Amino acid sequence: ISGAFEYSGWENFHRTQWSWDKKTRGAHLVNCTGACPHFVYSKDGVVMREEQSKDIAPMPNIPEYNPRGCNKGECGHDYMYGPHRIKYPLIRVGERGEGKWRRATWEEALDMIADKCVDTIKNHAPDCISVYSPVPAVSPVSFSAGHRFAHYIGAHAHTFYDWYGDHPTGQTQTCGVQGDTCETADWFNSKYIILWGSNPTQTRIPDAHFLSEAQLNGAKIVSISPDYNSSTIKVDKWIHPQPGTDGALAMAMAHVIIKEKLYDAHSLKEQTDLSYLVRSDTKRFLREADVVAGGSKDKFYFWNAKTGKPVIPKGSWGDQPEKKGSPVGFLGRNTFAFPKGYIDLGDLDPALEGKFNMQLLDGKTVEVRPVFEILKSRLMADNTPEKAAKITGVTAKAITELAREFATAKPSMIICGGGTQHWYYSDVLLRAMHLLTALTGTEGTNGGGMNHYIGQWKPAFVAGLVALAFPEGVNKQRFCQTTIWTYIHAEVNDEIISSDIDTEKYLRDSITTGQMPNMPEQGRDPKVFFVYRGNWLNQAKGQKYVLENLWPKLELIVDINIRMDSTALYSDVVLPSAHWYEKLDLNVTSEHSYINMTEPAIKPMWESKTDWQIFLALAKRVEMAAKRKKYEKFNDEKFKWVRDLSNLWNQMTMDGKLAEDEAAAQYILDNAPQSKGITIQMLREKPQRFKSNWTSPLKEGVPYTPFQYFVVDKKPWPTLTGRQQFYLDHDTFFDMGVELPTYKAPIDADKYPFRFNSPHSRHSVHSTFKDNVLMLRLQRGGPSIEMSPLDAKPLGIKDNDWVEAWNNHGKVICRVKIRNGEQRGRVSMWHCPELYMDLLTGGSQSVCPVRINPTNLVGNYGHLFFRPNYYGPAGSQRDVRVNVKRYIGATPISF
Amino acid sequence: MKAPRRQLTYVTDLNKCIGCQTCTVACKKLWTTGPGQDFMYWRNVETAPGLGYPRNWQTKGGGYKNGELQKGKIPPMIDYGIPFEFDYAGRLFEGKPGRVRPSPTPRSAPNWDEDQGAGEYPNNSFFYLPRMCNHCTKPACLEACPNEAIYKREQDGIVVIHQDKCKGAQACVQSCPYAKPYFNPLTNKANKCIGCFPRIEQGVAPACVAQCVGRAMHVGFVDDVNSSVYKLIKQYKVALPLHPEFGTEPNVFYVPPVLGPRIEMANGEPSTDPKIPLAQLEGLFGKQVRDVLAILQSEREKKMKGLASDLMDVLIGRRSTDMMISPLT
Ligand SMILES: Nc1nc2c(c(=O)[nH]1)N[C@@H](/C(S)=C(/S)[C@H](O)COP(=O)(O)OP(=O)(O)OC[C@H]1O[C@@H](n3cnc4c(=O)[nH]c(N)nc43)[C@H](O)[C@@H]1O)C=N2
Ligand SMILES: Nc1nc2c(c(=O)[nH]1)N[C@H]1C(S)=C(S)[C@@H](COP(=O)(O)OP(=O)(O)OC[C@H]3O[C@@H](n4cnc5c(=O)[nH]c(N)nc54)[C@H](O)[C@@H]3O)O[C@H]1N2
Ligand code: SF4
Ligand code: SF4
Ligand code: SF4
Ligand code: SF4
Ligand code: F3S
Ligand SMILES: [Mo]
Ligand code: NA
Fold this sequence. Notes:
The complex is a heterodimer.
Chain A: H1 8-17, E1 22-26, E2 38-43, E3 46-52, H2 78-81, E4 90-92, E5 101-103, H3 106-123, E6 129-132, H4 140-153, H5 169-175, E7 192-196, H6 200-203, H7 209-216, E8 220-224, E9 237-239, H8 246-259, H9 265-271, E10 277-279, H10 288-291, E11 302-304, E12 309-311, E13 356-359, E14 365-370, H11 371-382, H12 385-392, H13 396-408, E15 412-416, H14 418-421, H15 426-440, E16 449-452, H16 462-469, H17 482-489, H18 503-512, E17 528-532, H19 536-539, H20 543-550, E18 556-561, H21 566-569, E19 573-576, E20 585-587, E21 594-598, H22 611-628, E22 633-636, E23 641-644, H23 648-653, H24 661-670, H25 680-685, E24 688-689, H26 708-711, H27 731-735, E25 754-757, H28 773-777, E26 785-787, H29 789-792, E27 802-806, E28 811-818, E29 826-829, E30 881-886
Parallel strand pairs in A: 6-17, 7-8, 7-15, 8-9, 15-16, 17-18, 18-19, 25-29, 26-28
Antiparallel strand pairs in A: 1-2, 2-3, 4-5, 4-19, 10-14, 11-12, 13-14, 20-21, 21-24, 22-23, 25-30, 26-29, 27-28, 27-30
Helix pairs in contact in A: 3-22, 4-16, 4-22, 5-15, 8-12, 8-13, 8-15, 12-13, 16-24
Chain B: E1 8-13, H1 22-31, E2 44-48, E3 64-65, E4 68-69, H2 77-80, H3 88-93, E5 127-131, H4 140-144, E6 150-152, E7 159-161, H5 171-175, E8 182-184, E9 189-191, H6 197-201, H7 207-210, E10 217-221, H8 228-235, E11 240-241, E12 252-255, E13 262-264, E14 270-274, H9 278-285, H10 289-304, H11 310-316
Parallel strand pairs in B: 1-12
Antiparallel strand pairs in B: 1-10, 2-5, 3-4, 6-7, 8-9, 11-12, 13-14
The structure holds ligand MD1, ligand MGD, iron/sulfur cluster (4 copies), FE3-S4 cluster, molybdenum atom (MO) and sodium ion.
Region (Disordered) (chain B): 97-117
GO molecular function (chain B): 3 iron, 4 sulfur cluster binding; 4 iron, 4 sulfur cluster binding; electron transfer activity; metal ion binding
Binding site for [4Fe-4S] cluster 1 (chain B): 17, 20, 23, 212
């Protein structure tokens, strides 16, 4: 006998369901920040399912990252076989958006595109062509394909970090960095976490366990959110302010901490500009050029309380390192070239309080005060808990207690997100958050700091990406700033009267003085637009302006996609891109320190091609078109670059070296210090930890936390002052009233009664998986907008009724979900459902303009300059206001 | 039916479930992709309080009353939810006008009332309740079946519907008080959770455990004194079965939520009471809840003071293999 039990033979039916002949590595190349390792199971050449591989190496004493994954990821293979899939090259036959197509060969489709590209260069300008493809970390080879193509023909690229509102503007203003954040395992090292406009139960699904685990291990967690969000059911305390009033809350916390002397004075004196001396006459920093002949406009003073004399702090913009290093993309300047210990406080004792006299170059005596003295006086005057309680609706007692707890627990951390970053004035709010963190002195400590999480913006091996995407140098690449590009070319009405904020004047002056770019140059229209790896049109702010005003300027719109998204639906040519499980690419994120990847489980389906192979094929047909049109070489005076379109394919591949996808990916790994030594074969087997990181060392067995090269090794911060700089003494900051962190009330230019919130949902990754049938079956079959019962009932609105939301920018009609946890006075529409889904008109972006904050346009103040994804106007949208009413054309009964 | 040699045992930590539905999706894409199974979610996750799946399942009837088998209702299809269907082809590829609406007109679905819960702002409250077959020690489905098509495996205590022996009597559906057998109208057979016995047989945790992203799921044999399920059910005694009054002796247990904020009083200041009412948890898990929450609170408070707590460390689960049968596959 076999030993088998009575029904073992019949049970083979179920055993066969869990079987496969092939197992390969997979990843989901979507902008979720998960970068979750997966296996893909196939049988007879058909992918059956995927499952988390659960193979990130653990660190001692703290929970492992495994398994990661989420509800979209475990049905990711639905997009291989589903009704959305692009099988063949498609060319529009109807009007844009109708979904009337003809199938075309690759040859005809690429020839059409190639012919138009050459014509546009020949007849207009290369900068009338652009390529939008965001978040390189999600899929860096696929990103590099279109960018390298643009790189060699002179087309311009876009920005994404700021256009999305994810760029921590206030952090770049404070710290002189593009951005940085701890990996999420470091959350477990904190004793006290504030979740501030962040909903990780829904928006950090594979990482959320660290929070409940930290709590069971003795940490306390606070949630600050107007609505009772899904994350808040686990926290120890919930603070629910009015929307967009968080700055008032942060400044009152700063008040309590300063007044009650709960701050870390040593840290302030060494690591911030809060001892730097400010002239009482001009309100500017006292500078060396004021005091000394030929003195520097970029060196400053503090008052040394040990000697009773003014002293010039080391490390500021005018102080050079003796050994200059090369520029580093994520730093205002390469302060790593300074030696360790450079800004160590030594036996200095900078005064934080007092008034002092100093003698200028022209004899006269000026009163100077330390920044901290100015800040302190204003905070005592205007930012009491009692005053902030009136603005925020949070009790003064609660504000005070939060401030005390946050400053007392060590380490404490702020985790911020879209709820605090997607506002017009989010820059000054994040400065306030950084002020709270600097006062408690937790920057650069495990379990501490001001850690922002948003999208999948950070590729640690960025130098290898740049090498593949922009081989002749980023200084030889055209970039627009996409918020500006959209605002201008879509001819947006932001409803902000110029006598309140002269947006137009600031923007125009930004451009004509060269602080911010404007593409195309000389006022030409954009003409050709490549969109791929982003649903640019569906997610665009100002979408109704875009569709009416920008789209018709474009002569040719190409979408490359795995599926028919809304952008593709509104495109001229749609090219089938291979699914994540039919291609090779890398996949990384800021949330964990490991390199993920996908590889082909099977060959590209139907006639699809990988993104790398598509732009290689297009390169060949552009060569041919340039020949036919006798326009193969042309002078691009902007870069002193004689371009040769007849050799575009060899340019794309380095004479064929990088003609295979895998070699392109290996080229990235080889050309970054964070990854050199790692091979694809290693990554195929197991995810590999980065070898180094950005602004701190990456230590074996320890979670990354940023900025230790400044906090611990005492290199200067890459700011004008050389510190965490809370005083920005630029005209535009004075104009807007934010030379110091302070409360800026939200924009109320939309004259309508409900604030419009558009948070991110557990049920999709942006627009991707919105239309997935399983995801919809786990909701109510379509998009949702949420309302409090206290607003719905007076309007006659019942749960699951259709509601109409509108303002001057557009209107949307969507089914409502009445949720008691929603705060009265606001509605919450999960962002950017696809236009073709269960909406009677419009979508979330119909009601959103494009708005530009003038502080984000400053490009001539030390570390404030334009660099793509380093600084630029955020595409905020949480200030929007709408009205809501019941839609009465369809009122189905419930049962 | 006779006791099994070992009993596969689950623990669900409601302090850690994030309601992401990954487990719901994993089970469905593994076991219920076949004809007639579209409306079947062997694993499902419902917001509590709420109607659950199927709607109002908690008053469906079934189980045992003073040891006597109860015959409950058979839920109508609308209470499970007609699985929405969509015509993407027409709009996206065939030039048809008109939004890609769900069919039918939405009125019910397995997760219809997600995140609604109960209570008025600022004391609205809800949490997540994952559910599956409880592979009961007293399976009412098994006794009910007039064709002895349901059996309880001797090697691991997993309850299985034998698809050849089933004739579609639907007594199991009537008698399971958890509503976890689903009648398949295409095949005329009940289908339900198989405890992932094919994975268990190869030493791999069930998909709803191995793929749990919140890291809230435990599994093992309750006879293994070094397993987390033993420690939570038998040693520390903080894991309770769902609706014990149904009399089926479930082998799935729940650690009740002790995380969560306080009730907020009219002046904006906190009460000592939690937003999750004890009365709700008692409705789910019985009169032992109070004492469990006290243990949990006391042990968490040790951790807050920098002291050791073996129980907190069990729930934290710094290594997944301290919570479950190996999840690697
Ligand atoms: N009111 C409001 N507005 C907001 C926001 C808000 O909160 N409120 N949030 C923002 C934010 S923060 C973001 S990150 C955007 O939504 C991201 O949109 P995105 O187009 O990148 O993702 P999406 O997933 O939608 O598009 C990804 C596309 O890429 C396709 N795709 C995915 N993988 C591949 C691939 O490997 N190759 C190619 N060629 N394509 C691929 C995908 O099908 C989809 O079309 C934006 N606006
Ligand atoms: N499942 C899933 N996860 C995702 C994404 C996705 O599409 N799907 N997108 C990823 C990316 S790219 C983004 S940028 C992030 C965004 O995800 P999050 O950073 O979490 O940001 P939101 O979802 O916009 O808002 C988070 C919470 O802040 C609340 N909020 C709104 N306004 C305010 C306010 O004025 N003050 C305060 N204190 N709170 C406010 C919101 O209601 C919400 O409860 O998610 C990432 N994670
Ligand atoms: S979609 Fe993103 S979060 Fe979900 S499993 Fe895939 S990578 Fe992870
Ligand atoms: S839960 Fe229902 S189906 Fe599962 S064993 Fe118990 S009685 Fe049977
Ligand atoms: S044990 Fe297996 S069959 Fe049962 S619910 Fe979990 S995944 Fe589904
Ligand atoms: S997967 Fe884990 S955390 Fe997510 S819903 Fe299921 S049990 Fe809860
Ligand atoms: S009662 Fe028995 S015959 Fe089938 S439908 Fe249920 S197992
Ligand atoms: Mo984002
Ligand atoms: Na249609």
